[PDB]
Ligand binder design. Structure first.
Ligand code: MH0
Ligand SMILES: Oc1c(Cl)cc(Cl)cc1Cl
Length: 133
């Protein structure tokens, strides 16, 4: 289920983070235009940029922490507030989770893809309730 999936992702987090973020950028090319440093680069070129691997892993680590603290795929409102108060839009987040769920469904592994869909919706809603546009 959802909690085992957190363990699965953590066990190869850099690879999963990069591959899911690349799936997001390739599914939504316009989002990539908000990453000036990644425009005009293929997957393999992105994987050679230090801050691509470092930033994608850091984002997914925080996602895993929030997932770990959630109950029934509902994140803590206090985690959402911490996120909004750290240095975006709920629309871009919703698109990341669409790509994440599609990636899980195409994997041969028994990810709980419906729970991640719910978690993404609930995080988007909690971020909006906590003041993110
Ligand atoms: C595209 C959707 C998207 C998601 C989901 C996302 C998820 C998350 N981020 Fe982060 N982030 C996103 C898009 C950006 C952008 C576009 C920038 C610039 C950015 N994020 C930048 C940041 C920065 C500024 C410092 C930097 O990273 O170099 C932080 C601290 C950050 N993020 C945290 C997080 C955290 C924590 C999460 C986990 C919930
Ligand atoms: O370099 C970044 C990456 Cl790869 C992903 C996100 Cl979500 C943000 C930044 Cl600044």
């Amino acid at each position: 289920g959802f909690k085992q999936d957190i363990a699965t992702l953590r066990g190869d987090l850099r690879t999963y983070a990069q591959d899911i973020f690349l799936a997001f950028l390739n599914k939504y090319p316009d989002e990539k235009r908000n990453f000036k440093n990644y425009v005009g680069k293929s997957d393999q070129e992105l994987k050679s940029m230090a801050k691509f691997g470092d930033h994608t892993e850091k984002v997914f680590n925080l996602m895993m922490e929030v997932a770990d603290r959630a109950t029934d795929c509902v994140p803590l409102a206090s985690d959402a507030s911490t996120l909004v108060q750290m240095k975006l839009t709920t629309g871009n987040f919703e698109k990341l989770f669409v790509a994440l769920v599609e990636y899980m469904r195409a994997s041969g592994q028994s990810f709980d893809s419906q729970s991640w869909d719910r978690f993404g919706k609930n995080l988007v809603s909690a971020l909006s309730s906590a003041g993110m546009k």
